[PDB]
Every structure is written in C-alpha cells, then in structure tokens.
Amino acid sequence: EFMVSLPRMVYPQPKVLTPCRKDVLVVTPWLAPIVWEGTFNIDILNEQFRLQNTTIGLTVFAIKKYVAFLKLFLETAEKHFMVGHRVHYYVFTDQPAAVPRVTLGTGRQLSVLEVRAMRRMEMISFCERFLSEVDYLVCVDVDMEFRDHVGVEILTPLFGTLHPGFYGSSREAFTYERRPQSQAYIPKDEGDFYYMGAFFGGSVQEVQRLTRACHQAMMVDQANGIEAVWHDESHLNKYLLRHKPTKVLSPEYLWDQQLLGWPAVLRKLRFTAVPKN
Amino acid sequence: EFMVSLPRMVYPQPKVLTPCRKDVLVVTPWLAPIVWEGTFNIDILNEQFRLQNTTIGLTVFAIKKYVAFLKLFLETAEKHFMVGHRVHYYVFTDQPAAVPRVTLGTGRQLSVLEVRAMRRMEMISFCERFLSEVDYLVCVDVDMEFRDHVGVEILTPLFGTLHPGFYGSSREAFTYERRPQSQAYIPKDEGDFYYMGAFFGGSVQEVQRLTRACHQAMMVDQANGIEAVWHDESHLNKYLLRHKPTKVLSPEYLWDQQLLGWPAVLRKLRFTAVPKN
Ligand SMILES: O=c1ccn([C@@H]2O[C@H](COP(=O)(O)OP(=O)(O)C[C@H]3O[C@H](CO)[C@H](O)[C@H](O)[C@H]3O)[C@@H](O)[C@H]2O)c(=O)[nH]1
Ligand SMILES: O=c1ccn([C@@H]2O[C@H](COP(=O)(O)OP(=O)(O)C[C@H]3O[C@H](CO)[C@H](O)[C@H](O)[C@H]3O)[C@@H](O)[C@H]2O)c(=O)[nH]1
Ligand SMILES: [Mn+2]
Ligand SMILES: [Mn+2]
C-alpha cells in the first residue's frame, strides 16, 4: 500500500484555464473521471502503477464457436493491453484444446480454465484464486480485438464502459430492463449512463461484489420466471446505478466501426468488435 | 468498508456530449478531479458519504494573536462546513481560555488542544487520536471564514488546493523553493500546480504520511541551515509533486477577495481570507 515517491519527470504543465477536452464530459457528477484520449498523461500513470507492481487479470469466455475469436483477441492484447505491466489472462472455455498457442511478452501468463458446455457472473464471483493472484480484474467479451492502447488509465476500484450505441442518448431511450417484476428494473426517470456488459472491471474485491450481486439478482429473476431484456448487461446497469463506478471508460474502449463508423469525438478506437453472427 | 446501495434518486441526466465546465480544467493528467462548482451533484455525494457514516476532522491552529480569528472561523464553519455530516474540530492553541464558546449543530464536537507558545506539520503527525476518531482530516488556516458550501465533494485519500494567486501562472513563475540545498527544491521544468499550505487534507493515513514527510524534510533543512522560501507550503508542494493528490480543489476553496476580486471563473467564493497583519 505505502506509495514511494515518483521520480523527477519532465512533461507539459497542466494549465488550469485550458481544458483537455471541451467537446465531451470528462468527469461524472459523482467526481469519477470519464476516460478519453487527451485527459491522461500515461507516463505519470505508468509510473504510479509500476511503483505498486500492479498485476492485472483479464477474464474472457470462449465457449462453443467463440473459441475462434481467441487468437486475434490474445495476439492483439499482447500488442496493446497493459504492456509493461504484469498480466494474467484467464480463458474460460469448454474446449481447452482449441485455445491457440499465443506467444506472450515477459511478465505475462495465461491460464486455461475449463467450464461446462448467468455463467460469466457466476464463474467470476462462486468459482474464481483472483484474490491471491491479481490486484485488478478486467472482464471483457472475446468477439473483439485491440487496435490501440488500453492501459492503467482504466484501473480504479470499480469501472464501467459507455455503450457505443447509446452515449449520446437520453435516459428514457436506454434499453434498461423496464419491468418492475425484474431485479434489474430501472424507471424511465433514473439512470446516469448505459454501460455495456462487454467491458467492466475494478479491484478484485469490487469486481467480486459486482458479479456476486448480479448473479444473485439473476437467480431471483430466474426463480420468478423472468429474464432481463439484455441479460447480464441489464443487471450490470442496475448495479452501477446503485453503486457508482469510480471511473467510466469512454466508447474509445468499446466500439464497433462497422456499425458506427469513426466519429470525430473518438480520437482513438482502442478495443473493437470483430464480425460474428 | 462494504457500501450499501444508493436509494432511488431523481436528478438531471449527465450528458456525455455536454461538459459541465468548458472554461476550466476539471481533471488532472493523473485522472484526479479538480473540484469546481458545476462538476458535482452534491445530493449524490452526500448520500454516498452518509451511507458510510463519515466523520471529518478539521484542524486549525490559533496561536498568539490569531485566537481572535476563531469566533468567525468556527461560527461560519457551522453554517457551511460538512453540514449534515459528523464533524470534530481540533483547535490547537496556546490560550485555551481564549477559545470562544461557539454553539455547534448536532453531531459536531470541538476539542481544545493546548500547545506551547514546523509546528503544524509536527503536531498533526508525532502528537495527534485521529485514527481512532475521524475518517478524514482537513487542515486549514484560521485567518479565514466560510461563505459558501464546503462539503464532502472535497473528500478523497489526498487533496491539495490551488493557490488563488497562481492558478493561471506558468510553472517557472511558481514560488517553489529553488535552492538545490533544500529538501523542498523543485527545478524550473517540474511542477503541476502551486498548492497553498492553508487547505489540504485526505484520509487520516494519507494526511499523517504527508505531515510526517514534510516534518522530516523540514528537520533536515534545519540541520543543514536552510529554511524554505515559503516554509511548510514549500514542503507541501514538494510532497504533492512526488505524491499526486487524488483530488485538487479549485480556488473557490481558498480565496482572497480583497486582493484578487471575484473573477468570472469562480461561481462561488467558499472559504476566504479575513484581514490580518
Ligand atoms: O456462444 C457463445 C456466446 C457468447 N459467448 C461469450 O459471451 C460474450 C457475449 O456474447 P456476444 O459477444 O455474442 O454478445 P454481444 O451482443 O456482444 C454482448 C451483449 O449481448 C449478450 C447476449 O447476446 C448479453 O446480453 C450481454 O450482456 C450484452 O453485453 C462473448 O463475447 C463470449 O465471451 C461465448 O463464449 N460463446
Ligand atoms: O502568530 C501566528 C501565526 C500563524 N498562525 C497559524 O498559522 C497559519 C498560517 O499563517 P498565516 O495565516 O499568517 O499565513 P498566510 O500567508 O495566510 C499562509 C502562508 O504563509 C505562512 C508564513 O507566514 C507559511 O509560509 C504557510 O505555509 C503559507 O501558506 C494561521 O492561519 C494560523 O493558523 C498562528 O496561529 N499564529
Ligand atoms: Mn460481444
Ligand atoms: Mn492564512
């Protein structure tokens, strides 16, 4: 925990009367940063997190046909995800033999965890070691590739990611679960953001809290014969409404260029959808 | 530590493509919020901190003639400082009998701590109970009055406050200690901000770390026959350069209207200088 001093660093002075970005909201109303290109000096952040010998776990599920996405996912993670930091990939699959042999950089390891042919929330919270092995957990979809830097700027006790389809939408248009019979229910007059289920994370403790809560809520819904409109994403949205994230990632971090192009407000496309279905 | 769910709340939706403030920097390059009016929803923050039964300690020194400032300081603190939260004032003085009898709101207490006729840094770190009694410490000058809200928006593990004289200045003009013989030395090409010694704080653990480090550095300087240009403020600046604060308060939180007026960029003057000397 004790944090040693940063070394001398030479970098541009932040200027108080000059915003980093004037086109987007860069802090939430509960004083959580919203992470966009131009808001962070990665050299400062890399120093801070390296001085703590930070280890990041990345969970990814590749079940049935989705094992086909692992090669590009992992090879591009090696180019772009937390480079220079300690990384432990946890690949959950029903086909351990189908996991591609991917060459890893130093300080990085991969574990194949076999699961049977609620699953993600249940598996992350009560199956999965994480408390002993990593400091932060990052939980992502596999049908994706990294194209640009995804680094320690995302790390914080709890984060969600703005869904690329809805970041400009008003809350009444968000596809929250709207049936009061569901544990994921959010009224039309509530909601901060629509977070996508495909990229969330935080400290191990906070991710375990989130995934446990979502799993429990999904079990209640199952017992009551209701399934939320967007499954675990609906529950994730309910949890993050009631437990505010300490950072929010911009849609740079979860994008679909085929569907949504490359808007001016995105200076980088960092982690992007690969064609499926 | 475990955080219960927030209740349902009705408030304006934050809009991603609408900044709260376009005239000022609202996040540092290490992703610490810079606290300005318009950046926070105090209802959300009050809920979050009340659900933790947060207790805030406020330290203030009133030695020799400065005991005269206590009445206005404390009476205005009662109107504006952390109202609704648990507050423990710690008044350090050489004249306990000169401390005014100030009426306090419920959930608020005051302790008079006698000291002899480095003192603040040494006293806060190794004399002073804080770990047992409060969650956060806020350390301020006494030659001041509260005019507007100062609340839980400031609370974070470690914060400093932008000096009202220098928030628009370039770093070469900052009055950092510039002699390499001083522990407080900062070269002309380093520095983020010029923080004022008159308002800093954080968790008890981080404030004890800061004050211990500054006290130790000041003792080294004394042993070497050098006194930093701005005394404890010079050391505070060195510490916060090397240990980045997790929030930075805007000059709303430390202002002198006689000297600097009321610029457009300040929507509120919250904690202001009273004439002295
Ligand atoms: O056969 C499979 C199916 C899924 N998966 C795993 O589940 C992840 C989500 O599914 P998908 O990407 O299709 O949904 P998207 O539309 O990108 C993601 C969204 O829709 C989901 C249902 O299809 C949920 O509602 C989720 O909460 C929401 O974010 C996928 O990346 C794999 O890691 C797998 O391993 N094998
Ligand atoms: O006789 C005294 C003298 C001081 N104090 C106490 O010290 C605080 C700082 O002093 P002051 O406000 O004069 O300095 P300012 O210019 O506002 C504050 C600045 O200058 C200081 C030296 O005068 C230091 O350099 C400090 O670090 C810097 O911020 C004052 O508010 C009292 O709580 C006291 O109790 N009795
Ligand atoms: Mn997907
Ligand atoms: Mn003062």
Side-chain angles (χ1 to χ4, degrees), chain A residues 2-85 87-100 102-115 117-118 120-125 127-257 259-276, chain B residues 2-85 87-100 102-115 117-118 120-125 127-257 259-276:
Chain A
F2 179 76
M3 178 67 175
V4 299
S5 290
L6 290 162
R8 152 182 171 90
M9 296 176 71
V10 178
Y11 51 77
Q13 189 196 166
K15 289 303 305 109
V16 168
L17 301 177
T18 298
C20 287
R21 295 290 298 262
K22 307 178 84 191
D23 52 335
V24 296
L25 186 64
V26 306
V27 68
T28 71
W30 57 92
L31 295 177
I34 309 182
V35 183
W36 299 91
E37 182 68 7
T39 66
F40 57 93
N41 183 141
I42 195 56
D43 297 323
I44 299 175
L45 294 173
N46 277 330
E47 281 278 356
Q48 290 182 310
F49 282 91
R50 276 306 301 148
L51 288 170
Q52 299 257 122
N53 198 205
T54 303
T55 303
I56 308 89
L58 185 59
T59 70
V60 64
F61 291 73
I63 293 165
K64 296 191 288 206
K65 298 195 167 169
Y66 282 57
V67 292
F69 293 116
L70 282 167
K71 185 161 182 287
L72 183 65
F73 176 90
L74 292 170
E75 290 185 340
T76 61
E78 283 299 302
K79 296 187 152 48
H80 299 296
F81 182 74
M82 304 289 170
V83 176
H85 295 90
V87 170
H88 197 146
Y89 304 99
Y90 299 99
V91 175
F92 295 90
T93 187
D94 59 340
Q95 302 157 75
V99 179
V102 173
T103 309
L104 310 181
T106 191
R108 307 173 73 98
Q109 60 188 299
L110 186 146
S111 297
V112 177
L113 297 320
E114 187 170 7
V115 302
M118 287 189 285
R120 298 196 293 178
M121 297 298 191
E122 179 200 43
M123 188 67 36
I124 293 164
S125 63
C127 304
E128 292 290 280
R129 194 181 175 156
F130 294 152
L131 286 166
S132 61
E133 293 189 330
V134 306
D135 297 305
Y136 295 91
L137 280 168
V138 175
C139 307
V140 300
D141 276 23
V142 75
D143 59 318
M144 304 290 292
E145 61 176 322
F146 295 84
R147 299 193 199 185
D148 210 328
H149 172 99
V150 174
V152 298
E153 71 279 0
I154 76 176
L155 302 175
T156 192
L158 180 62
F159 71 87
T161 303
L162 297 181
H163 194 297
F166 300 98
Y167 65 92
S169 296
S170 55
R171 52 155 71 113
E172 57 265 36
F174 293 163
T175 61
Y176 292 149
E177 176 56 59
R178 301 304 188 174
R179 291 168 295 175
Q181 297 73 26
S182 173
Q183 295 314 294
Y185 171 58
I186 300 169
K188 289 269 180 73
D189 59 354
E190 292 179 56
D192 303 306
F193 303 111
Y194 195 78
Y195 305 99
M196 191 166 183
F199 196 163
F200 64 91
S203 66
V204 176
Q205 180 171 232
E206 291 303 307
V207 174
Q208 309 274 236
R209 284 168 172 169
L210 181 151
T211 56
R212 182 181 341 115
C214 288
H215 177 43
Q216 290 176 167
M218 288 178 317
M219 286 187 308
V220 170
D221 273 10
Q222 184 180 43
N224 293 156
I226 186 165
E227 175 75 12
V229 58
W230 286 105
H231 314 109
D232 69 11
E233 175 171 281
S234 297
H235 291 94
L236 172 69
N237 273 282
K238 181 62 171 284
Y239 186 88
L240 293 175
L241 174 61
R242 302 296 207 232
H243 304 83
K244 306 300 192 196
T246 55
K247 295 183 179 169
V248 173
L249 308 186
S250 70
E252 299 167 359
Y253 291 85
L254 220 41
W255 197 255
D256 184 330
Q257 188 182 20
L259 196 65
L260 296 159
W262 192 334
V265 72
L266 303 185
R267 298 184 178 181
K268 292 185 167 205
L269 302 184
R270 308 169 185 277
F271 184 53
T272 60
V274 175
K276 62 175 181 307
Chain B
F2 179 76
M3 178 67 175
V4 299
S5 290
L6 290 162
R8 152 182 171 90
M9 296 176 71
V10 178
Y11 51 77
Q13 189 196 166
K15 289 303 305 109
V16 168
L17 301 177
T18 298
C20 287
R21 295 290 298 262
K22 307 178 84 191
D23 52 335
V24 296
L25 186 64
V26 306
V27 68
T28 71
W30 57 92
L31 295 177
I34 309 182
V35 183
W36 299 91
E37 182 68 7
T39 66
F40 57 93
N41 183 141
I42 195 56
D43 297 323
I44 299 175
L45 294 173
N46 277 330
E47 281 278 356
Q48 290 182 310
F49 282 91
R50 276 306 301 148
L51 288 170
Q52 299 257 122
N53 198 205
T54 303
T55 303
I56 308 89
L58 185 59
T59 70
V60 64
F61 291 73
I63 293 165
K64 296 191 288 206
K65 298 195 167 169
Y66 282 57
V67 292
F69 293 116
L70 282 167
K71 185 161 182 287
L72 183 65
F73 176 90
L74 292 170
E75 290 185 340
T76 61
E78 283 299 302
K79 296 187 152 48
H80 299 296
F81 182 74
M82 304 289 170
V83 176
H85 295 90
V87 170
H88 197 146
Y89 304 99
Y90 299 99
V91 175
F92 295 90
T93 187
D94 59 340
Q95 302 157 75
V99 179
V102 173
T103 309
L104 310 181
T106 191
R108 307 173 73 98
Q109 60 188 299
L110 186 146
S111 297
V112 177
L113 297 320
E114 187 170 7
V115 302
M118 287 189 285
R120 298 196 293 178
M121 297 298 191
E122 179 200 43
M123 188 67 36
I124 293 164
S125 63
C127 304
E128 292 290 280
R129 194 181 175 156
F130 294 152
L131 286 166
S132 61
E133 293 189 330
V134 306
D135 297 305
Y136 295 91
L137 280 168
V138 175
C139 307
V140 300
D141 276 23
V142 75
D143 59 318
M144 304 290 292
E145 61 176 322
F146 295 84
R147 299 193 199 185
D148 210 328
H149 172 99
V150 174
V152 298
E153 71 279 0
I154 76 176
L155 302 175
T156 192
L158 180 62
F159 71 87
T161 303
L162 297 181
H163 194 297
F166 300 98
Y167 65 92
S169 296
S170 55
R171 52 155 71 113
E172 57 265 36
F174 293 163
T175 61
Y176 292 149
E177 176 56 59
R178 301 304 188 174
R179 291 168 295 175
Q181 297 73 26
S182 173
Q183 295 314 294
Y185 171 58
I186 300 169
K188 289 269 180 73
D189 59 354
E190 292 179 56
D192 303 306
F193 303 111
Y194 195 78
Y195 305 99
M196 191 166 183
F199 196 163
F200 64 91
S203 66
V204 176
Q205 180 171 232
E206 291 303 307
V207 174
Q208 309 274 236
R209 284 168 172 169
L210 181 151
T211 56
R212 182 181 341 115
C214 288
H215 177 43
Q216 290 176 167
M218 288 178 317
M219 286 187 308
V220 170
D221 273 10
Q222 184 180 43
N224 293 156
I226 186 165
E227 175 75 12
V229 58
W230 286 105
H231 314 109
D232 69 11
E233 175 171 281
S234 297
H235 291 94
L236 172 69
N237 273 282
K238 181 62 171 284
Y239 186 88
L240 293 175
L241 174 61
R242 302 296 207 232
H243 304 83
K244 306 300 192 196
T246 55
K247 295 183 179 169
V248 173
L249 308 186
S250 70
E252 299 167 359
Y253 291 85
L254 220 41
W255 197 255
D256 184 330
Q257 188 182 20
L259 196 65
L260 296 159
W262 192 334
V265 72
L266 303 185
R267 298 184 178 181
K268 292 185 167 205
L269 302 184
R270 308 169 185 277
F271 184 53
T272 60
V274 175
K276 62 175 181 307

